[PDB]
């Protein structure tokens, strides 16, 4: 045998943690991605990219730290340590938000290594790899928001930062400037994810209460752990129950377990389509007919028209410090207020 | 011939019918029929509803120039408060519709019906000789139903602060709630979000693993029933890779190597998550709010250094000043 | 001429039909509000 | 308010075209049963 064959069979030993060809992309990239988040949310500042503090060394707690984004003038720059901005200086590199990109890109290739790992593992045991396919819903979300979306904006500064309060901020930001709740694709995302949680609770409960071996002692001697269950309950008692409660039930176990896979995944995919649409600031912001009808008759008032006023507020009062590079100054007589209507 | 009381009492308690009708069902059917029928008629053609007691109504009906994404049933006026307010509490019908009575009628009938629905689930499980506590899982959506339609209005003191029954209505409620109680920084909603993302994750995983494992299942089937042996073939081998990575930690977290606990864990995770966030909205009705981090960091010259939480508090001001029209001088408020 | 032997019948049962129609009508109802804007 | 004719036709074809595809496929499946 040649050295290649010897390498290949070293990588696929039965052992506690599986290395594999996929491991070579996954493990260093994952370590550096994760570890960069940690070293940065403990030490690295953002006084120079946003005018904030965001690390423990400065004062902050677990919810208010973050590794934050670059400044707006940096463009879509890679932010290489050897690039023509840092020039081989680890301090400036930390100061310019250069390691947000480090984390992001290393985590993206860590994602890629994980899905390959799922393929070749599943190839080894010789089963269909549906879980690798399910896992491309998280990849879709990741790349459409953390990579594609600010690449449609003017800079990475409008990308979300890795941190709890920073992404709470992302929520309120999108609410204000895109009115993201009124977009049919996010509605389809909400329906999908909530339906996943619905199937999860209903299935667990139904199965746990149609168990075989409720009387005499277990006549089930295996698992056989890779079977999950499905042997341990009676399809007929559950199907008969739900045909009377709800009036429709599944009569095929395989199709039930396929529905549970379909729902959250199509869910994530649709919300991905919507947010890659927001990346060119095409917004289902308003119904044209409602605006006309409100202009001509100003006693018309809708829960929707209220949401527009509130979002105007979010934008106007949050902008100067969320975009401190624009230098917004709003005299207080120009800001919007309820008592002024 | 069998004494109509027993013909009635047999026909109701029958487990042979198409859809079960229970003793709880005898209460579920008229309350749900009222709630559903009043909602269809109201979502189409309810007259505009003064909801703030300033005589400026808010439209909510398709025939009055809304589409369905901008429609809602608009809560009762600010003059009602917690008062019971049926039809015969109004001296004419048009002032009843103007005051937003339909909302109250709907939400009371629905709450009654939901509890009866939970009850009927317990009853059929008892009847078929099943185990109980599928309804215990169902108490999670009932709890949030209670919190957002009954408990949060009582704490705020009016049925005009309840969640409107609509699409844009629901989103308006969310926005004006975050503005005053800062719920993202409240932990009980966080346990809720964790439950929902985790529920979706575990749903996806369970589906994918089982649906590759199963080869084929079969049961003999006759001309009105199912057979004698529910047969299935599933694969029963696996590699040390997944055992050392995923298997070791689900078995350690169940603190049992039985895979009986898998579906158990499956049921428990969203339900418990959603219980805690249902606690959140309830306790927030009594004006106990989430975290606020303000001026966490200042330098030694007495100048504040902003944090990522201060941007959020600025948006809270933004939404809140628009959500009071009442005076310019609102000093200390709620309640 | 002579028959193609790869010709296969297509099947569709009633429960799938009900889901499909549910999908058509429910998406249609979600998107009609944007189609009229 | 506005009433698009284009909106009327957009919804009309969106609900008519796939539904007729569906019912044709069903009605020619049932005739293969005998």
């Amino acid at each position: 045998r040649g050295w290649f064959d010897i390498l290949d069979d070293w990588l696929k030993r039965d052992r506690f943690v599986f290395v594999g060809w996929s491991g070579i992309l996954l493990f260093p990239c994952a370590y550096l991605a994760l570890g960069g988040w940690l070293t940065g949310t403990t030490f690295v500042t953002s006084w120079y990219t946003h005018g904030l503090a965001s690390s423990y060394l400065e004062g902050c707690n677990f919810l208010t730290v973050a590794v934050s984004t670059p400044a707006n003038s940096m463009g879509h720059s890679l932010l290489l340590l050897w690039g023509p901005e840092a020039q081989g200086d680890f301090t400036r590199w930390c100061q310019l938000g250069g390691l947000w990109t480090f984390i992001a890109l290393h985590g993206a290739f860590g994602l890629i290594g994980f899905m390959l790992r799922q393929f070749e593992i599943a190839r080894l045991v010789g089963v269909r790899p549906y879980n690798a396919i399910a896992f491309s819903a998280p990849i879709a979300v990741f790349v459409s928001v953390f990579l594609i979306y600010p690449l449609g904006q003017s800079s990475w500064f409008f990308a979300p930062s890795f941190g709890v309060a920073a992404i709470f901020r992302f929520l309120l930001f999108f609410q204000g400037f895109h009115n993201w709740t009124l977009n049919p694709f996010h509605m389809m995302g909400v329906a999908g994810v909530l339906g996943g949680a619905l199937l999860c609770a209903i299935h667990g409960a139904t199965v746990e209460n149609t168990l075989f071996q409720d009387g005499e002692g277990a006549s089930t001697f295996r698992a056989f752990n890779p079977t999950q269950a499905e042997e341990t309950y009676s399809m007929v008692t559950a199907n008969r129950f739900w045909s009377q409660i709800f009036g429709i039930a599944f009569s095929n176990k395989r199709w039930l377990h396929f529905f549970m896979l379909f729902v959250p995944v199509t869910g994530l995919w649709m919300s991905a389509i919507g947010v890659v649409g927001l990346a060119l600031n095409l917004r289902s912001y308003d119904f044209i007919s409602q605006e006309i009808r409100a202009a001509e008759d100003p006693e018309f008032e809708t829960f929707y028209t209220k949401n527009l006023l509130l979002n105007e507020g979010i934008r106007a009062w949050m902008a100067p410090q969320d975009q401190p590079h624009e230098n917004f100054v709003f005299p207080e007589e120009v800001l919007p207020r309820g008592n002024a209507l | 011939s069998a004494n109509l009381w027993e013909r009635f009492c047999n026909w109701v308690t029958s487990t042979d019918n198409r859809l079960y009708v229970g003793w709880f069902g005898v209460i579920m059917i008229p309350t749900l029929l009222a709630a559903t029928i009043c909602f269809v008629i109201a979502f189409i053609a309810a007259p505009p509803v003064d909801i703030d007691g300033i005589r400026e109504p808010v439209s909510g009906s398709l025939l009055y120039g809304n589409n369905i994404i901008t429609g809602a049933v608009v809560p009762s006026s600010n003059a009602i408060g917690l008062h019971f307010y049926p039809i015969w509490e109004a001296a004419s019908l048009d002032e009843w519709l103007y005051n937003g009575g339909p909302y109250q009628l709907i939400i009371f009938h629905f709450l009654l019906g939901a509890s009866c629905y939970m009850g009927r689930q317990w009853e059929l499980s008892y009847r078929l000789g099943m185990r109980p506590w599928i309804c215990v899982a169902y108490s999670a959506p009932l709890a949030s139903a209670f919190a957002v339609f009954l408990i949060y209005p009582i704490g705020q003191g009016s049925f005009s602060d309840g969640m409107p029954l609509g699409i844009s209505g629901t989103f308006n409620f969310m926005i004006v709630f975050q503005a005053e109680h800062n719920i993202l920084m409240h932990p009980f909603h966080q346990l809720g979000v964790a439950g929902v993302f985790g529920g979706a994750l575990f749903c996806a995983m369970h589906g994918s693993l089982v649906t590759s494992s199963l080869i084929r299942e079969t049961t003999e089937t006759e001309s009105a029933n199912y057979g004698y042996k529910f047969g299935q073939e599933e694969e029963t081998y696996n590699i040390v890779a997944a055992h050392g990575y995923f298997g070791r930690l689900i078995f350690q977290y169940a603190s049992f190597n039985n895979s009986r606990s898998l579906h158990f864990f499956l049921a428990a995770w969203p339900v418990v998550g959603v219980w805690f966030t249902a606690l959140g909205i309830s306790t927030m009705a009594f004006n106990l709010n989430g975290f606020n981090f303000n001026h966490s960091v200042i330098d030694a010259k007495g100048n504040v250094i902003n944090t990522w939480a201060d941007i959020i508090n600025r948006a809270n001001l933004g939404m809140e000043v628009m959500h009071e029209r009442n005076a310019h001088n609102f000093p200390l408020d709620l309640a | 001429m002579e028959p193609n032997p790869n010709r296969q019948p297509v099947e569709l049962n009633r429960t799938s039909l009900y889901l499909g129609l549910l999908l058509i009508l429910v998406l249609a109802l979600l998107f009609s509000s944007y189609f009229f804007n | 308010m506005e009433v698009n004719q284009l909106g009327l036709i957009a919804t009309a074809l969106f609900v008519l075209v796939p539904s007729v595809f569906l019912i044709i496929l069903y009605v020619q499946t049932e005739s293969q049963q005998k």
Partner: peptide
């Protein structure tokens, strides 16, 4: 013409409910 479309498509959904409950396939 818009309100008509909304209520018509809803009317169709409840008819779908009725048939899917009382006229479903036999389980064979």
């Amino acid at each position: 013409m818009e309100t008509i479309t909304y209520v018509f498509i809803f009317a169709c959904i409840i008819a779908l409910f009725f048939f899917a409950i009382f006229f479903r396939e036999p389980p064979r």
